[PDB]
Design a binder for this molecule. Structure first.
Ligand SMILES: [Cl-]
Ligand SMILES: [Cl-]
Ligand SMILES: [Cl-]
Ligand SMILES: [K+]
Ligand SMILES: [Mg+2]
Ligand SMILES: [Mg+2]
Ligand SMILES: [Mg+2]
Ligand SMILES: [Mg+2]
Ligand SMILES: [Mg+2]
Ligand SMILES: [Mg+2]
Ligand SMILES: [Mg+2]
Ligand SMILES: [Mg+2]
Ligand SMILES: [Mg+2]
Ligand SMILES: [Mg+2]
Ligand SMILES: [Mg+2]
Ligand SMILES: [Mg+2]
Ligand SMILES: [Mg+2]
Ligand SMILES: [Mg+2]
Ligand SMILES: [Mg+2]
Ligand SMILES: [Mg+2]
Ligand SMILES: [Mg+2]
Ligand SMILES: [Mg+2]
Ligand SMILES: [Mg+2]
Ligand SMILES: [Mg+2]
Ligand SMILES: [Mg+2]
Ligand SMILES: [Mg+2]
Ligand SMILES: [Mg+2]
Ligand SMILES: [Mg+2]
Ligand SMILES: [Mg+2]
Ligand SMILES: [Mg+2]
Ligand SMILES: [Mg+2]
Ligand SMILES: [Mg+2]
Ligand SMILES: [Mg+2]
Ligand SMILES: [Mg+2]
Ligand SMILES: [Mg+2]
Ligand SMILES: [Mg+2]
Ligand SMILES: [Mg+2]
Ligand SMILES: [Mg+2]
Ligand SMILES: [Mg+2]
Ligand SMILES: [Mg+2]
Ligand SMILES: [Mg+2]
Ligand SMILES: [Mg+2]
Ligand SMILES: [Mg+2]
Ligand SMILES: [Mg+2]
Ligand SMILES: [Mg+2]
Ligand SMILES: [Mg+2]
Ligand SMILES: [Mg+2]
Ligand SMILES: [Mg+2]
Ligand SMILES: [Mg+2]
Ligand SMILES: [Mg+2]
Ligand SMILES: [Mg+2]
Ligand code: NA
Ligand code: NA
Ligand code: NA
Ligand code: NA
Ligand code: NA
Ligand code: NA
Ligand code: NA
Ligand code: NA
Ligand code: NA
Ligand code: NA
Ligand code: NA
Ligand code: NA
Ligand code: NA
Ligand code: NA
Ligand code: NA
Ligand code: NA
Ligand code: NA
Ligand code: NA
Ligand code: NA
Ligand code: NA
Lengths: 73, 237, 56
RNA sequence: ACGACCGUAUAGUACGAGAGGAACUACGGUUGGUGGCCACUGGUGUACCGGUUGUUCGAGAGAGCACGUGCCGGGUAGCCA
RNA sequence: CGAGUGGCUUGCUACCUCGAUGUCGGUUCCCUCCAUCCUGCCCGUGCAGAAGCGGGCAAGGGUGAGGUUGUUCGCCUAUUA
RNA sequence: GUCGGGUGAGAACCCCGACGGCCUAAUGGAUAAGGGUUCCUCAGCACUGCUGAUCAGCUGAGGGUUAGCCGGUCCUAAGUCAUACCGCAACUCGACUAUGACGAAAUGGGAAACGGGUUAAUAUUCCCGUGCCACUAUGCAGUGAAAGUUGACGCCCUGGGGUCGAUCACGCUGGGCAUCGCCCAGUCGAACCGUCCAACUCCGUGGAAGCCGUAAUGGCAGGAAGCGGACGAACGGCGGCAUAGGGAAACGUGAUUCAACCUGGGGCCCAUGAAAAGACGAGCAUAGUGUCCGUACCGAGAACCGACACAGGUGUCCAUGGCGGCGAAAGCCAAGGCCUGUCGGGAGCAACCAACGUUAGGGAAUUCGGCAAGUUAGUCCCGUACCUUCGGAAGAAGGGAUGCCUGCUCCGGAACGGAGCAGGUCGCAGUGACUCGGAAGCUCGGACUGUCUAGUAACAACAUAGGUGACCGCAAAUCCGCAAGGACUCGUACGGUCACUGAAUCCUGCCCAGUGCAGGUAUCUGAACACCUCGUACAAGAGGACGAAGGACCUGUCAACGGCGGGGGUCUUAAGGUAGCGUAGUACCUUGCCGCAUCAGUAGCGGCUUGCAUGAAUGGAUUAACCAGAGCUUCACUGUCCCAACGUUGGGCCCGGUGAACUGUACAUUCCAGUGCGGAGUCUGGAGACACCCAGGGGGAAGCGAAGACCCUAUGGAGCUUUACUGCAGGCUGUCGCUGAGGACUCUCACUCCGGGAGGAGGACACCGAUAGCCGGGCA
RNA sequence: GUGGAAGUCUGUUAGAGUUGGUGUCCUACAAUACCCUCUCGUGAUCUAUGUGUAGGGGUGAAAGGCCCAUCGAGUCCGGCA
């Protein structure tokens, strides 16, 4: 997490880097199969190490609050 | 005095140009004779150096292989379609007329066939509100209500990469790396920190702008700096 | 770093060379233009009235 | 090329109700200055002698280098305070 | 209130230098002046003594160390004849 | 450097030997650029060489550079040019769009070479031997043949394969030493041809419901382990090459750690890490062809740039030689190089100066200030405060240990790896040299890493993430161009432009009167064309009607410029200073008052505070961490001081040789006084004064150096500013032309934009040309 | 315990920078040098070569810094006696 930043940058900056990255690094449930093996491959790029499915998602999350509204509408 | 930075920009010298030779593709909707039959398969997902957002590689039926402005939720193997009769699923592109009102859209054309102009940055989207035989009313990400020819093509879904702005850069070095991929001069020296000869706000025994910051629309380049034709300033009221 | 003597050390770059057209060591091999006769820039020969006094 | 001060005897005296408290003279010492000197104390002393680290000359012996002594201990003459 | 002496301060003047006479303070090293702080020799005292106060001759010698401040100046401390 | 010796007319410095030293990422080896013959030989010394020279990078004359397989050449990169088109008064000018070409010699991509030998000087080029590539021809094979693969790729961590080197063991060959028995060198052998294959991926078998596996992550009924198999690596192993070559000889075998090279796994990105030619895909024999350019040498304390044989500057590779140790560190030493960072001889070698060692007792008294110097130091164990953004503070502080020798234990496959134990033992001192922090506290500033005045400023200044406001829907906002056109932009509001503030934390009050910007606007003002009236047989001209932007007027707006007082229990001019902070890096009075601390403190810190003249993104307060930033205090330390001494090395002094410059109206042995344009060696009066020379520290020559930077003057200059004067770009707006049909409206045919086209959008507007009004330090 | 992040620390590794000494030099070795000290040293890092931007114009993390010893408007020649 934010520990790599030492005593630099201040509270908000690193509290948010940790928050974003913790969610970022959480196990994510693949859209194709249902296994929790989705890992970020880069900015907005996600992939399942199980089946290999490579998806377009948010920058730090595979699903964004807006991408979800799409499914409905 | 000397030309101000905003003036050095226009000359298009190396310092101010985008590293175009390093860019991948000019994201534009494919051209279809008609019928809509055109479909393709997503072959890969790549990073777009010009937008800090993902983009999708697609192989079309007629052999054409082109990168595409990827909405969120598109993955390898998916089949995308482009045409009047395209199914109504995310990742597909069709004219605003064939799109059901109330659906989020991206990469909207300004005029039919221009390949897409609006809503293309990370995580954004337009909102098709009203239909008609003459006008398709779309709400752009800025919040504006835009009247467009219903023949203007668009892509179903919101642009991928949403939430990019949520994380702070934290350090100068991170901005640096991003700035190196854009047509921009960075870092930025404040005008008031310069000499009178270099900027209208330059000079003085201490740092402060000489005159008021709100400048007229009619001001000539070299003088148009600060708050341009500001209808108001501050936060109060 | 001193702009004088110490900065003279990096000067091992070849620019002006013997020109094919006029024979002067003025053909800038980087620009491919002779600063003396204009070769590479002009079919006509480089020449100006200010190269001599006004009434001569 | 000597200036000045402190102390002792004078004297708990002269003076003075008392409290307190001199001097001449003779002494001892200090301080500042001055000139010289090295028996004494002290400094230096890459003269010298010893110890010892690293390395090289195979070991030993005996040595070089480590800034103009590698470092540490002792230190004659001389020069000095 | 009146008469002066000095040429350290300040002010005035604009004589000297603008083809340049290197600044303040400090330091180091030398000479000097006396309107004398100490020392010598004296006079007066509201001079008992002791300790002083004031004055005269006198420039031989001495007039030191520190805390704040760039300070000069000055304030402060302990020594001091 | 020294002693001998060689050559020579001549020898400190040219050569030989010995002895003594210097250089170890360089003072060695190979090279890029750049130089250009400086390379080698012979002959020389008038020139050059910091002295000399028989020497030479000097002078003269000759000689020297050999390529199918090393580079160039070919490809394409950022980008450049040429032609066409268009612009421009015009071009040797100019942007776009086409086409074509150019653009990499160490260091991008890339068909192919190794070993030995040889010259005074070349060498993967010549010679000997061997190998290899491409093209073409002949012949056999082959119909396949272009899909695909490769070329071809970022940063961080890491496993495995593995050669050289280094080291260890043992044998052989040669050498060194001479109380031992040790120590050193060698022990060789290519390209290429052939073969082997770990990792990855995949197949079959198998059938795990908890097992499999890693340094780590991980893997699996969507099929784990095991087993069998396909594909598949090295500049590596192995065999050939090789009764080749090389060596005086022996002409080894194993091992560990393993640069090169090969091949995997993991992690990171608001960053995504070239392209093209070419190769592979796609067999073999024989033969022919393989032209053109480069190739010497230096590559630097003498061959390059810096006027010089200049202590400066100048890229790449050798990063694996030994000891040492964490180490590409120090110190010492090999290989290799050098004694050319090129003037010597003499004096115990004085004064004085440069670097520097040691100084008793005191210990910052020195000083603006601890400037300078000193102290501490490596490693292990113990232990560690306030504060804090919980990361840090921290190596806080403080305490202890540390060598050698003998015998051992533990970890590990092992190391010539690491961690310990017991006993013995020497010194003043065991990180014994070397290498190697002094520590603690208070306050100010900027959050941090970063940037900067090349050459007196490194800071508190700039930047920054973060906070905020402004403009813009893309035929945009902003900006460049005279134009043709162009940057932003392979971009599209989660964008990018224009500004302000400057991490975090707690916060950010009141004012829209002036100024700025913006919106609105009954009425007022507001140009030109067209229109109406007068005038003129026409015209000039006067006047009217209409009225755009703009202005008046109204409104919004301060995280817009900025403002936040005097008086009384409102007045100027809108408000009248809120949270906070405060004698401030802002406080004149001022060394403010009180306290802390000291013998004594214009300093420093804390409190008070009526603030000459604090205050909220002109940001206020505050703040952990960081800092060659400013001030202060303590411990430690010490030649900074009391107060100086002695010593070391290089000079200085004498001698040989070489050999400048500054400066010079003249005269000149001066001193004390005076005078003089008031600051005299020279005038006047006196005094003193025999001449010349050496060394010294610099009192005077208002010493030398520079037509004063300060100041003023000149109807001097320049940069900068603005509501100075006058104009000029640019923006807005009306009008005319392009421009057409039927104070408001439709249409389509010019014209503009979108679309490959069909066609769609817009449309007499816009663009462009002309002109009029307003704004207009952007510029002159 | 493993793992090995960082505009992270120590560091004369290479390399970059340039704080103090107001040392040496100041007709220099040098028209910006020498020595000691000192800062950075995985990153907004340093660097070679190629390449682009040109004078009221560039370039500028902004010092009026830099654009060949030349900068509050380069250099050359001309206007110009
Ligand atoms: Cl950004
Ligand atoms: Cl070559
Ligand atoms: Cl692995
Ligand atoms: K003057
Ligand atoms: Mg594009
Ligand atoms: Mg980060
Ligand atoms: Mg850029
Ligand atoms: Mg800034
Ligand atoms: Mg400034
Ligand atoms: Mg200006
Ligand atoms: Mg400010
Ligand atoms: Mg400001
Ligand atoms: Mg310059
Ligand atoms: Mg020695
Ligand atoms: Mg003088
Ligand atoms: Mg008297
Ligand atoms: Mg006297
Ligand atoms: Mg030669
Ligand atoms: Mg000869
Ligand atoms: Mg080419
Ligand atoms: Mg190459
Ligand atoms: Mg040779
Ligand atoms: Mg050669
Ligand atoms: Mg030399
Ligand atoms: Mg002492
Ligand atoms: Mg003191
Ligand atoms: Mg003092
Ligand atoms: Mg110091
Ligand atoms: Mg074991
Ligand atoms: Mg030590
Ligand atoms: Mg203060
Ligand atoms: Mg800072
Ligand atoms: Mg400077
Ligand atoms: Mg600094
Ligand atoms: Mg400096
Ligand atoms: Mg700042
Ligand atoms: Mg900001
Ligand atoms: Mg932001
Ligand atoms: Mg911002
Ligand atoms: Mg105070
Ligand atoms: Mg405010
Ligand atoms: Mg006379
Ligand atoms: Mg003058
Ligand atoms: Mg002036
Ligand atoms: Mg002027
Ligand atoms: Mg067009
Ligand atoms: Mg002007
Ligand atoms: Mg760092
Ligand atoms: Mg460091
Ligand atoms: Mg360059
Ligand atoms: Mg300035
Ligand atoms: Na200003
Ligand atoms: Na003068
Ligand atoms: Na003085
Ligand atoms: Na006296
Ligand atoms: Na004082
Ligand atoms: Na010599
Ligand atoms: Na092989
Ligand atoms: Na070693
Ligand atoms: Na750093
Ligand atoms: Na106002
Ligand atoms: Na206003
Ligand atoms: Na204020
Ligand atoms: Na810094
Ligand atoms: Na000393
Ligand atoms: Na003198
Ligand atoms: Na000027
Ligand atoms: Na952990
Ligand atoms: Na320095
Ligand atoms: Na100019
Ligand atoms: Na002229």
């Amino acid at each position: 997490r934010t520990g790599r930043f030492g005593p630099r940058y201040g509270l908000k900056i690193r509290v948010r880097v940790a928050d974003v990255e913790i969610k970022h690094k959480k196990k994510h449930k693949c859209p194709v199969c249902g296994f929790k093996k989705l890992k970020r491959a880069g900015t907005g790029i996600w992939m399942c190490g199980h089946c290999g499915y490579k998806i377009a998602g948010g920058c730090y999350q595979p699903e964004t609050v807006a991408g979800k509204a799409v499914m409905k509408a | 005095g000397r030309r101000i930075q905003g003036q050095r920009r226009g000359r298009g010298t190396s310092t101010f140009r985008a590293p175009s030779h390093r860019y991948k593709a000019d994201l534009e909707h494919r051209k279809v004779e008609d019928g809509d039959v055109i479909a393709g398969t997503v072959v890969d997902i790549e990073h777009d150096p010009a937008r800090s957002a993902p983009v999708a590689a697609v192989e079309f039926e007629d052999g054409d292989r082109r990168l595409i402005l990827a909405p969120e939720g598109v993955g390898v193997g998916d089949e995308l379609q482009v045409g009047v009769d395209a199914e109504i699923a995310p990742g597909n592109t069709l004219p605003l007329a064939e799109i059901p009102e109330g659906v989020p859209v991206c990469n909207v054309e300004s005029s039919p066939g221009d390949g897409g102009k609006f809503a293309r940055a990370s995580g954004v989207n337009a909102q098709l509100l009203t239909h008609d035989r003459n006008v398709a009313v779309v709400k752009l990400p800025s919040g504006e209500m835009k009247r467009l020819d219903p023949q203007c093509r668009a892509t179903i879904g919101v642009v991928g990469g949403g939430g990019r702005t949520d994380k702070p850069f934290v350090k100068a070095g991170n901005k640096h790396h991003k700035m190196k991929a854009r047509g921009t001069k960075w870092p930025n020296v404040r005008g008031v920190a310069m000499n009178a000869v270099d900027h209208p706000f330059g000079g003085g025994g201490r740092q402060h702008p000489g005159k008021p910051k709100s400048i007229s629309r009619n001001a000539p380049p070299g003088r148009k700096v600060g708050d341009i034709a500001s209808k108001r300033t501050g936060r109060g009221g | 770093t001193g702009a004088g003597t110490p900065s003279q050390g990096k000067k091992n770059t070849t620019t002006h060379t013997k020109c094919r057209r006029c024979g002067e060591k003025s053909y800038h091999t980087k620009k491919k233009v002779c600063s003396s006769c204009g070769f590479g820039k002009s079919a006509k020969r480089r020449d100006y009235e200010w190269q001599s006094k006004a009434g001569e």
